[PDB]
Structure 1
């Protein structure tokens, strides 16, 4: 996350971190329930085998609240392709259930029509992750969050050198130096409504990080709600 703030105790409980063999975090994810994690499909190519850590806010040490979970089943969207980054979504089922607690809780899945007319028409959303704090920098050891304004769909298409499909949306600033970045992928983009946070996006991609005239691109969760339900049901 470039700019923004540090997630304080209990502020970003639905955040999940995918870690590789060396216990290094390479992508984020969102806690949907005790057994399910939402993430980006392009994160499944960033590492051979990986585990999911919840409750962490600082990777430099072990507070005692963190918790690691093995991945039982991996459900990647079949239509995903690195060529367009379209359908950049995946759901992970854990072997053991997450123990909800301080810093560990799920984000709510909204209904499609309500989400699109009431959540995505809000001024801002919130993105978080352990990603880079600068375009060329390293992974952050502290979990960060950032209020990102929803971006007019038209303005976004005109600013992008790549196609913005109906399965993605944009958020962030035109020139202000705040944006998600590499390492935040798969992470949550949630929208607040009356003190309740609903999953609305998945950190997907962007041309650089916080670059002027460029926005952050996210997978439009409302476009995959049925797909998500199926993944969690079956």
Structure 2
């Protein structure tokens, strides 16, 4: 989270801290149900052993609502290839039941047609997580959130040396230093609609953090809503 400000207590409930063997978040987590956590499938290449400390608000110290949850199994996409930049999504079934409480409330799927007609057609989107407070600044001690706007397809294509597929879309600022960064690995990025935030995607890659001419390479949630549900029912 380059720049930005802290998630107020309860403002980012689905947001989770995937605590690894050393219990420090190697990835941004996303509460999905009483037993499920969402992260990008890139997080699977960074794990010795890992848990989900839902409700965490400060990496410095435990300050309320921190319940440790253990991933039962990961639903990795079978077409998930790093080169495609696509399907970078890993649904994390949990052994420990997620207890819906303060700072614990997931983000569920809207109508696929309505999501395509409304979610990706919005103006800005909100990203949260214990991310790098600057492009390279230190990881956000507090749970810091940030809002980023949508980017046109051609702008993302010219702004990327690589493919901008039918799903991936840029979101951020042309030169302003504010976006998701190291710490938002699978960090939940949402979009407000009548106070109901909708996860419109999560950065996968990109040149630096909110660099000049660069943007977060988000994943079109509406593209794989059917796959998101089928992985909700998978494993």
Q: Note whether the superposition's TM-score is higher than 0.5.
A: yes
Structure 1 gap ranges (5+): none
CA contact 2:135–2:178 (8 Å) conserved in 1: no
Q: CA offsets, 1:175-212, max 9 Å, x none?
A: 11111112202111111111111221123121101111
Tell me the distance in 2 between the aligned counterparts of 1:4 and 1:63.
20
CA contact 1:50–1:71 (8 Å) conserved in 2: yes
Q: CA offsets, 1:24-48, max 9 Å, x none?
A: 1110121111111111000111122
CA contact 2:174–2:212 (8 Å) conserved in 1: yes
Tell me the distance in 1 between the aligned counterparts of 2:180 and 2:136.
13
Q: CA offsets, 1:9-67, max 9 Å, x none?
A: 11111101112111111101211111111110001111222111111110111123111
Q: CA offsets, 1:108-160, max 9 Å, x none?
A: 22222211211211111111111212233332221111111011111111111
CA contact 2:69–2:94 (8 Å) conserved in 1: yes
CA contact 2:136–2:209 (8 Å) conserved in 1: no
Shift of 1:73: 1.3
Where does residue 134 of structure 2 map in the other structure?
Answer: 134
Where does residue 40 of structure 1 map in the other structure?
Answer: 40
Q: Which shows bigger deviation, 197-206 or 117-126?
A: 197-206
CA contact 2:207–2:214 (8 Å) conserved in 1: yes
Shift of 1:82: 2.5
Where does residue 95 of structure 1 map in the other structure?
Answer: 95
Tell me the distance in 2 between the aligned counterparts of 1:132 and 1:101.
27
Q: Which runs of 4+ in 1 moved over 4 A?
A: none
CA contact 1:70–1:96 (8 Å) conserved in 2: yes
CA contact 1:19–1:53 (8 Å) conserved in 2: yes
Give secondary structure in 2 for the equivalent of 1:220.
coil
Tell me the distance in 1 between the aligned counterparts of 2:49 and 2:78.
19
- Computed over aligned residues only, the root mean square deviation of the Cα atoms, in angstroms, reads 1.3
Structure 2 gap ranges (5+): none
Q: CA offsets, 1:199-226, max 9 Å, x none?
A: 2112312110111111111111111111
Tell me the distance in 1 between the aligned counterparts of 2:45 and 2:140.
21
Superposed, 1:1-234 pairs within 5 Å as: 1-234=1-234
Give secondary structure in 2 for the equivalent of 1:229.
helix
> Number of matched residues?
234
Q: Which shows bigger deviation, 216-225 or 129-138?
A: 129-138
Tell me the TM-score normalised to structure 1 length: 0.95
Tell me the distance in 1 between the aligned counterparts of 2:52 and 2:183.
14
